[PDB]
Amino acid sequence: PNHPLWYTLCDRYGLYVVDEANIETHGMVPMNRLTDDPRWLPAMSERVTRMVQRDRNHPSVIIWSLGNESGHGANHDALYRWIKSVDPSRPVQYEGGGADTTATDIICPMYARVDEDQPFPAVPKWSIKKWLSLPGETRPLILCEYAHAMGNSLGGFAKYWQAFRQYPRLQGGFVWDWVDQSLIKYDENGNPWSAYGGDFGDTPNDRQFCM
Amino acid sequence: VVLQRRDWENPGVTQLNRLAAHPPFASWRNSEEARTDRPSQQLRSLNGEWRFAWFPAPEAVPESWLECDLPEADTVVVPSNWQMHGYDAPIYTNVTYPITVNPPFVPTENPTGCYSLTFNVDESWLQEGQTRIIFDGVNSAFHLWCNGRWVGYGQDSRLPSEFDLSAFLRAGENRLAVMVLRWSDGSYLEDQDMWRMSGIFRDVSLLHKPTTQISDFHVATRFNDDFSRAVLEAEVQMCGELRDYLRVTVSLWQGETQVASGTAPFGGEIIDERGGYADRVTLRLNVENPKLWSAEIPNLYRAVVELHTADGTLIEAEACDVGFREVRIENGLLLLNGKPLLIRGVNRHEHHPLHGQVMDEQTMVQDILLMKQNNFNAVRCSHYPNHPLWYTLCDRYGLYVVDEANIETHGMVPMNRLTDDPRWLPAMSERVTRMVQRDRNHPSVIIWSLGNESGHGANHDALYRWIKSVDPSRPVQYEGGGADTTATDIICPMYARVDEDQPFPAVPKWSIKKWLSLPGETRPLILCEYAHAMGNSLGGFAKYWQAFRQYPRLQGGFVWDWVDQSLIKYDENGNPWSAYGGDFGDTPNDRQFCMNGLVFADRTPHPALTEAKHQQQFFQFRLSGQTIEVTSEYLFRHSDNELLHWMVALDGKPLASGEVPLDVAPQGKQLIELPELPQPESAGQLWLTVRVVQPNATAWSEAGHISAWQQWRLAENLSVTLPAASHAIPHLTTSEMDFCIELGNKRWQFNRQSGFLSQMWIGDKKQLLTPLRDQFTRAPLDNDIGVTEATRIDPNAWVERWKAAGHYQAEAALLQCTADTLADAVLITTAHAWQHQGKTLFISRKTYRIDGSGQMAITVDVEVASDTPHPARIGLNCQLAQVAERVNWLGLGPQENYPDRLTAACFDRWDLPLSDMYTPYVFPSENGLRCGTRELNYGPHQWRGDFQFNISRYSQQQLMETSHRHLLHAEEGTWLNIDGFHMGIGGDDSWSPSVSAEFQLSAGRYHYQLVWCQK
C-alpha cells in the first residue's frame, strides 16, 4: 500500500490503481513455504484486511492484489475469499503460483511473451495469446509485469500492443517499471553520482538490477 | 511478565511456544508395533494423581508455587473438571455469556486452577531426541512451567496443546506447573449451550520423537468411476537434517496381509519458481478392488509410515486406520462411494453425570453401541472437536462424523459481531485449521463444520475457502446466518419444520421441502439439528422421515440430542439425584434446558429413543393381500445377517407365526408370500406384526437383535352377539345428597351436589379416594412451557394460553343430575359447565348406565368453546384406592406413546409392573400415556372402549408442582387418567408452539364411551 496521498491524486488526476498488500516472500524455498502455512495466516491477513479497510473508498482503486511473489498457498485462497466477501465491487488478482490460480480473477502473468511459450515446470509462462484459450479458460489477461525496462530496453514493446489491440481478452499490462532505484552518492569533490547495489558496501547485493 | 501481559485478555495471543498441530502420533520404534496399534514405549500417560490448588484470580497465586508444592493443595485425579471436585460451581447458561460481554476482557475475579506434578524422566529420553508434553484438553487457557521455568501458553479448550520440554527437563525427578484460567478471550468463542466448566479435562501425555522425525502425514484415497480401483496418496513431512540416504516407506495392510507398499527419498515435485519441498515426499500406492468403508461395513486397512535409511534402519514409524471412501456432492446430492446418503444422525455432547466433560472409553463405547442399536449411522460433534479416541471408535464401529470447530459466539449482538471482525480472524482460524490438521486422516469424518451459532461473518467465508483448498475430499458446512449462506455446501438448518414455514426476518426457517426448490437453489439439505428431544418429546418425528424418504435431496439430519446434560448431586442422606441449571447456585441459568437427550445421563433410554429407532429403520415394508414386500435402504450391504419373523394375533391372542430369511440386495426388494391363515370364528381384529431379527452377534449388537418392525390390520370380525341376559336388576336408592345403586356386592354412589361418581364399593370396600371427574388439562411438558418464566411471561406458549384462559383454575358447575330406573338398568344423566370469569370453557354431558351384569357404561359428550385455546386432553380421572403390582392392557405399547409419537408402538396384549407406567423425566410432566387402548386391567377393575390412558402414583397436580423427579412422593392409591382424546406433544423445537394442527384438539365437539366392570 502506498502513502495515503497517492490515492487522492489518482482519484483527482484519473489513474486506475491496483492496490497491493505488503506481502512478498520471494526468498523462501519453495516460494509458498510461509503462505501455505496456517501459522502465518494471521500476519498475512492483517496486511490484506487493513489495506482494504483503509483504501476501500478510493474510486481510483479498481483491483485488489494479494501481494507479490509468495507462491500460491492456502492462505491466499482464504484471503482471496475474504476480499470477495467484504468488497464485491473490485476484482481480486494475484500472480503467484502460475498466474492463473484459484486466488485470481484475472490471468496476471509477469513477463509472459506475446508469441513464445516458456513452458517452465509447474509455473509455465504461456504465450499470452495461447493462455487465453487454454481448455476451460475464460478469464481476462492483464500482465502484472511486462516489458522489463532495464537500461537499453523495451525491444519488442510494439508486439505487445498489436496483440492487446487484436485480442479483446488481452486487456494490457503494467510495464516494469516507472523509475530507476538509483541512490545519490558523492565523490571526493562533493559531486553527486547515481549509485546501485553494492555501492554502500552492501553484500550480498544484486548490483544494477534495482534500475 | 505473565501477570503483566495478560495474554488471556488478548485475541491476538492464542498461544506462546506451542508446537504445530498434526495427526495422532506415537513414535513407534518397531514397525510391527505400529502395524498392530499396540502401545508405544515412546508415548507415556500422565493420567495420574496431580496436585491441585484453587485461587479466585491469577494475582492470588503465590510465586512459591512455581518452585515447590503448596501444602494447602490437594491430590486429585487428572483428567478432571474442578467443578466436579467441588472447588467452585458449574454454571448452566444457554445463550447469555457466563461473563459480562466486554471483549476481549474477562472478570478480574477469574477462578484459577493451579495444577502440578512430580514425575520421573529416564536418562535415555534426554540423551537423544525430543521430549514433548501433550495437553489434549485444557479449559479454557493455561500457562505451563517446567522445573520453575516458563514453557508456554495455550487457548482453545478442545484441541491438544503441545510443548517441547527437551531443554527444560533433567534426569531423575521433574516438576510441571500448570496455571489454568477459567475465563479468557477464548471464552468469547466458547458459548455453547452446555455446562460451563474448567480444568485439565482431557489426557496429558509425554511423547518422545527422534530429532529426524515424521512431523506430518496426510492420507488421500481416490477412485475410478466404479470404485474397482483406488490410488492411496500419502504426503509425508519430516523435520531434522535432510539427507540423501533418508527414505519413507508407506505400507498398506489388510489384517496380516500387506496389500501395497511404496518407498521414496525426500524431495517433492517442483511447485513454483523456487523449487519444491525438499522436506516432503508423496507416496502413491495402487489398490485393486479396495474394500470400501461406510457406516454399513466399516472396512479398514492399516497404513504404516516408516521413516528409515536406504539400507533399512528404522528411525521411527507412525500409523493410522485407513477407510477407502469418497465423499462428494454431485447434482445436488451428497454421495458416499457414489451412492446418496440418508443421514440417521444425532448430535452428541461430551457429557458424564459424575465426571462432567471428561470422556472415558467405556462411555464412548456405550454411546456408540446404543446409537447403532437404535439405527443411527451418523454423529455431529456438537460443538467442538472431540476426545481423539472418539474418531478411532467411529472409524472402527462405523459412524459418519461431522467434525466441528470449537467456535460458538451465540451471545453476541448481533450473532456475527466477532465473526465478521478481522481482528478475531486469527483466533477463529486456529480453531478451524488445527482441527483439520488433527483429524483429516479419520475415514469417519465425512464433513467439516465451521462451528455453531456465530452468525455469518467474513471470517467464515475465509475459513470455508481455506478448508476447500487444503482438503477437497470433504464437504464443508455451517448453519450460521440462515443455513444456506456462501459458507456452506449443504443447506443445514436447525429445527426447520417439514411443511410449515417460519419466515423470521433475515434468517427464515423455510419448510424443508420448500427450501430445496427456492429459485436458484441446488444443494442437498441435511438438518444439523432437528426433533428437539427435551423431556416428553419427538412428536412429529415420523413426518420428517416420510419427507426424507420421499425427497432425494432431503438427506436426513441430526437429532438434538443424544444425552441429557444432567449432573449428579447428593441429598442429606447421601442419596444421588439428577440436577440441572440453577442447582449449584449458578445464576443466571437456563434451568432444565440442558436436558434434551434421547437417553438419560446414565444412558437409560427415554421413550422417544424407540420412536427414533423405528423411523430410522433400514428395511421398509408393504403389504398386499398375502404378500409382504421388503425393501432394503442399505446402500452397500446385502442382508446377510437378517431374518423376518411374522406373527398374526387376534386381539393379542397368537394364531400363527413363522420366519423367512431376508435375501435383499442393497436398495433391492424381496417378496414374501404368507401361508393361508385359518379364519377365526371368534370376533375381533387380526393384527400382523413383522420384525427383522439379526441371528448373529455383531461388533455392535447381540444375537437376536431386532432392527426393524411393522404392523398391519388384517381381517376384522365385528361382534354381533348379544351378551347373556342377566337375571338381576340394580336397585336405586335416593337421598338429598346421593343417588346410590346396588347390585350384589357392588355399590355405586353419585353425589347429587357435585354430579360425579364419588364412590364405588366391592363387598363394602371403597374403590375411590377421589371422585371420577372430567379433566381437560395436563401437567405441562417442556414443549408446552417453552421459554416462559414468572419473571418474563411468553404469552404464546401453550401453558400460558391454558393458564390465561383459566383451564387450570376452572371449576365444574353442575347443570343437571338425574336418575331413572329402567327395565334392567339404572341410568344416571349429568351435565356440567366449566367456567372462568363468566366464560364457559367446556360442557360435559354424560350418561352412566349400570345394568344387571354389573357393567357400568359411561357415555361422554364434550363441547369446547371455539375461542378458548385447544385443551391438552379430554378425559376423566380419579384416584383409585387400590395399589396393584401389574398393569395389563390391550393397546399400543409396551412403552409410552402419544398421538404424534406412537408409530414405534405396537398393538398387542401388554403386561408391565406399575413402575414402568411412569416415565422418570428429570423435570416432571404428563408422562406414561399409552394410546389406542381397547382394554385396561388394574387389580379387580377393567375398562373397555377406545381410549388413551396413563396410570401412576403421582397426580397431575403433583407433577405440575414438582420441579425435580427426586422430590416426587407416591400418593395414596393410584391416579388413573383415561382420555377420549389427548393433544400432541410436539417437539419440532421446545421454545415455540410445535404441535401440528392435526394433533390439536380443535373439533369443538367430542364423544367417547367407556365400560367399567369387575375383571
Add this chain to the structure above:
Amino acid sequence: VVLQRRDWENPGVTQLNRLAAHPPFASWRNSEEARTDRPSQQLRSLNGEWRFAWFPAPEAVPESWLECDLPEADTVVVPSNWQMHGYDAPIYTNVTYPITVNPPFVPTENPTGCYSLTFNVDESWLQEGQTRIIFDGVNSAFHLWCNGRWVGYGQDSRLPSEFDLSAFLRAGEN
C-alpha cells in the same frame, strides 16, 4: 518485558494495543470545512525535527532514553529513512533475504532507531475526547512509549499504526 518477549521474532504478535484500521479521518467540527477538504484543527502534523540515536541492537538501548533525551542523539527531519542520513547502509538484494532465512528469528545484531519528540497539546484535548497518534509508515517494527510509559507495538511497514494516547498525555510538555 519488552526485551523479554521479543515481539519482533513472533509472527503471532503483529501489534499490541493498536487501534482498528479505517479510511482517512480528519475529525472536522465544521461541515463546510469537511466539504471543501480544508485543514482540520483536530488533525495535527508531527512532521517536524525529532531526536534520533542509532543502536546496533535493542539490547544496547539505555533505559534512561525512555525518561529523557540522550545528549549523544542528533536532531533529524522526520519522516526519514535513517540510511539516508548515513547511520547505516541501505542494502540492495533482489530475491535472497537480507537476513539468514530462519523464521521467525532475525539477527541479534539488529539496527535500532531510537526516535523521540518533545511536544505539547491543546488544553481542550486533555479535558474531553480521544487523542490518538498515527504513524503512517514505520519500517519494519516498533515499540511506542509516551511520557516514560509503554503504549504499544506495531508491524507492517506500509500501513498506518494508530494508538490511543488519551490516558498517557498531560498538561505542558510530553
